[PDB]
Amino acid sequence: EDICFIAGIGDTNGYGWGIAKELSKRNVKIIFGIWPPVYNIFMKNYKNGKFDNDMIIDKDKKMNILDMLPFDASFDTANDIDEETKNNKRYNMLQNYTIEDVANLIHQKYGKINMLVHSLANAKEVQKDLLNTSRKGYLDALSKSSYSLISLCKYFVNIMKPQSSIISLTYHASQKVVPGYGGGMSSAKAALESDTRVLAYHLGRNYNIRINTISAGPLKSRAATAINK
Amino acid sequence: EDICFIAGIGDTNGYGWGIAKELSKRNVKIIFGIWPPVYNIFMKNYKNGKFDNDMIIDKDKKMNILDMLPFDASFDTANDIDEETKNNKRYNMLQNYTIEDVANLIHQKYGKINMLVHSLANAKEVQKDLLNTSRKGYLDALSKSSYSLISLCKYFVNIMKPQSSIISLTYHASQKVVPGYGGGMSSAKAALESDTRVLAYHLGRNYNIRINTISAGPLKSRAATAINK
Amino acid sequence: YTFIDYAIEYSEKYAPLRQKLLSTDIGSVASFLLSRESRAITGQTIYVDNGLNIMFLPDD
Amino acid sequence: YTFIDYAIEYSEKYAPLRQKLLSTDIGSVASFLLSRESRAITGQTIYVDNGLNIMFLPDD
Ligand SMILES: NC(=O)c1ccc[n+]([C@@H]2O[C@H](COP(=O)([O-])OP(=O)(O)OC[C@H]3O[C@@H](n4cnc5c(N)ncnc54)[C@H](O)[C@@H]3O)[C@@H](O)[C@H]2O)c1
Ligand SMILES: NC(=O)c1ccc[n+]([C@@H]2O[C@H](COP(=O)([O-])OP(=O)(O)OC[C@H]3O[C@@H](n4cnc5c(N)ncnc54)[C@H](O)[C@@H]3O)[C@@H](O)[C@H]2O)c1
Numbered sequence: 001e002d003i004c005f006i007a008g009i010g011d012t013n014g015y016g017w018g019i020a021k022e023l024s025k026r027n028v029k030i031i032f033g034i035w036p037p038v039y040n041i042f043m044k045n046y047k048n049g050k051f052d053n054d055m056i057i058d059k060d061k062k063m064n065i066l067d068m069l070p071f072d073a074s075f076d077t078a079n080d081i082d083e084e085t086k087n088n089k090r091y092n093m094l095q096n097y098t099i100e101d102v103a104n105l106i107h108q109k110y111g112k113i114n115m116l117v118h119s120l121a122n123a124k125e126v127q128k129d130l131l132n133t134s135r136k137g138y139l140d141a142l143s144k145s146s147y148s149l150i151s152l153c154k155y156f157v158n159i160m161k162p163q164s165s166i167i168s169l170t171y172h173a174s175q176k177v178v179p180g181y182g183g184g185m186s187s188a189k190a191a192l193e194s195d196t197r198v199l200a201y202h203l204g205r206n207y208n209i210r211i212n213t214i215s216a217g218p219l220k221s222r223a224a225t226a227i228n229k
Numbered sequence: 230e231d232i233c234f235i236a237g238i239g240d241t242n243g244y245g246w247g248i249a250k251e252l253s254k255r256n257v258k259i260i261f262g263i264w265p266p267v268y269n270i271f272m273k274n275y276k277n278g279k280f281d282n283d284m285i286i287d288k289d290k291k292m293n294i295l296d297m298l299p300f301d302a303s304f305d306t307a308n309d310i311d312e313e314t315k316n317n318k319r320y321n322m323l324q325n326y327t328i329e330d331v332a333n334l335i336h337q338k339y340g341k342i343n344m345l346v347h348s349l350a351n352a353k354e355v356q357k358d359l360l361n362t363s364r365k366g367y368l369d370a371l372s373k374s375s376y377s378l379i380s381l382c383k384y385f386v387n388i389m390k391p392q393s394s395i396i397s398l399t400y401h402a403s404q405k406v407v408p409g410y411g412g413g414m415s416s417a418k419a420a421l422e423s424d425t426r427v428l429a430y431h432l433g434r435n436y437n438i439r440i441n442t443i444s445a446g447p448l449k450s451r452a453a454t455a456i457n458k
Numbered sequence: 459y460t461f462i463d464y465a466i467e468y469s470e471k472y473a474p475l476r477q478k479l480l481s482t483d484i485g486s487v488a489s490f491l492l493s494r495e496s497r498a499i500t501g502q503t504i505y506v507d508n509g510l511n512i513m514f515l516p517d518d
Numbered sequence: 519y520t521f522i523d524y525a526i527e528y529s530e531k532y533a534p535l536r537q538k539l540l541s542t543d544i545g546s547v548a549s550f551l552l553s554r555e556s557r558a559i560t561g562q563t564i565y566v567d568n569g570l571n572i573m574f575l576p577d578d
């Protein structure tokens with residue numbers, strides 16, 4: 001029984017969906033981690049059948065989603081939630097969306113998993129070039145897009161079976177310069193790739209868990225459309 | 230129907246065999262390319278049932294071998310073989326073992342194939358460090374271990390279906406130095422890895438064929454033992 | 459005409475493999491890395507970009 | 519004591535994944551690269567070495 005948690009799904013036009021689509025081909029149970037801000041709109045679209053066609057697997061089957069949970073990669077534990085968001089319009093009617101909370105939530109409902117997918121990224125100032133990115137914007141990119149992978153591993157390794165596997169997505173902008181990919185995203189991806197190596201060592205030696213990162217090519221996804229350059 | 234040609238099998242202790250074993254799990258037909266010097270000894274052991282236990286594929290499957298042909302990677306065409314090797318005790322009774330001839334042979338008996346594996350390497354002066362390797366020894370290592378891949382591609386691309394895939398094996402000694410890996414083998418692997426990129430361009434653009442190389446870890450194969458260091 | 463449209467057009471023209479990169483192309487690769495078929499691979503950055511990353515100077 | 523024994527021993531003690539590297543470990547990865555499941559990967563050097571290559575300084 002394979003269960004995979006995919007953190008970073010907001011629709012069917014991103015890589016998260018492509019990964020979920022291929023995993024279910026192999027009958028693995030899928031759990032989605034949806035960023036609170038778009039969680040309701042996502043459930044609405046799902047409920048009204050907007051994704052029915054996108055859920056049909058080649059072999060003439062229905063993609064099987066075990067569960068869909070609100071999840072924000074910028075909060076590690078319950079006490080990390082600031083009062084501003086704590087009372088935000090989109091968060092109020094939601095709960096248990098921190099990294100540790102969904103880890104406990106998933107474990108409480110489905111037991112241990114053996115597949116983890118980090119498929120998210122964010123950066124307040126992605127529209128500015130590296131030189132004009134502020135300290136706050138830079139740290140925001142690394143927090144959401146890089147550290148989020150480390151925190152995920154730290155809390156989820158507890159609910160994972162030995163020999164389980166973890167992947168994340170990165171982009172070549174970390175190694176070669178592509179103008180337009182600003183706001184510290186290139187910095188975050190460069191850290192993601194390096195951390196993947198270091199984490200491979202700690203997770204490999206201590207838990208026999210593997211971790212790798214996929215450097216993908218261009219895909220016209222929602223986030224991709226947001227890079228005005 | 231998938232047909233894979235594996236070049237570089239002299240026993241069941243190398244990577245070529247592990248590749249064949251895994252390929253049969255997926256039901257792809259396997260054609261072995263055996264170096265003449267060990268061709269007869271391989272057939273002998275095979276016929277007398279020495280590899281019977283090694284052909285067992287977990288799910289009570291028996292590794293199915295389509296054909297077993299003599300193959301020497303140092304000869305591109307029939308008129309490249311010198312009189313000496315042509316009359317040598319081990320070659321005399323064999324024929325059509327050059328790269329061009331096996332390609333025409335396979336295409337004639339089975340038509341087009343869609344999988345090519347380059348699992349071979351050799352160097353006369355592997356026991357000497359790079360600095361003390363002669364021009365002859367060095368060129369020998371590159372001719373046998375690197376050019377053989379370019380040649381396999383040139384002749385086999387004509388008997389391969391579009392979207393077919395090609396792989397070869399390399400070693401980290403090409404990027405980082407490891408004393409003991411001499412005779413220009415580190416050089417040969419550096420070339421192979423570089424040529425894999427260039428060939429990926431030509432093969433990709435023209436024939437829509439893919440080519441990658443696997444950098445493997447340490448395996449106690451027959452050839453591994455020959456590295457007296 | 460937007461960053462992503464440029465990158466996509468550039469990829470489809472200069473990458474070794476001139477084909478449309480689908481989200482499921484990354485999916486099948488993810489699927490393989492998450493299974494036990496890849497038990498010996500870890501701490502790696504695997505490129506799934508039709509090979510664009512290996513190019514230096516484009517044809518045009 | 520022979521180059522290969524040293525290489526194997528060093529790999530099994532310092533690699534991120536401490537397990538014996540089997541010929542079929544490379545085989546399965548080879549099987550994946552040869553199939554259409556990896557239609558978007560080309561020109562790459564894929565490491566199947568239990569992650570040894572990512573290490574710089576050994577523990578002890
Ligand atoms: N599209 C491409 O061309 C491309 C290329 C290479 C790498 N990538 C990477 O693929 C991954 C997924 O991106 P995508 O392009 O499929 O876009 P996508 O927009 O579908 O997915 C990114 C998701 O991250 C979520 N997100 C943002 N902040 C979050 C937070 N704090 N907590 C949780 N979720 C949060 C969003 O809801 C969004 O669905 C990213 O890591 C991206 O860098 C994408
Ligand atoms: N064993 C390892 O530890 C190791 C590690 C990394 C990479 N590799 C690579 O794996 C590949 C296969 O090596 P292996 O280690 O499994 O050893 P192996 O000894 O089983 O295979 C090499 C084969 O090449 C054949 N050969 C030599 N010259 C030839 C020629 N002119 N024409 C055709 N065949 C010829 C030999 O008969 C032999 O079977 C090589 O390319 C090697 O560089 C091996």
Ligand SMILES: Oc1cc(Cl)ccc1Oc1ccc(Cl)cc1Cl
Nearest residue numbers: 120121122123126171218223224
């Ligand atoms: O990494 C990416 C690379 C490319 Cl070519 C296109 C889109 C990408 O994805 C992002 C870029 C910026 C921000 Cl803020 C969030 C995400 Cl998900």
Ligand SMILES: Oc1cc(Cl)ccc1Oc1ccc(Cl)cc1Cl
Nearest residue numbers: 349350351352355400447452453
């Ligand atoms: O590439 C290799 C790397 C390692 Cl660690 C062990 C064996 C290898 O394989 C060879 C080394 C030298 C020669 Cl002459 C022929 C072959 Cl097949």
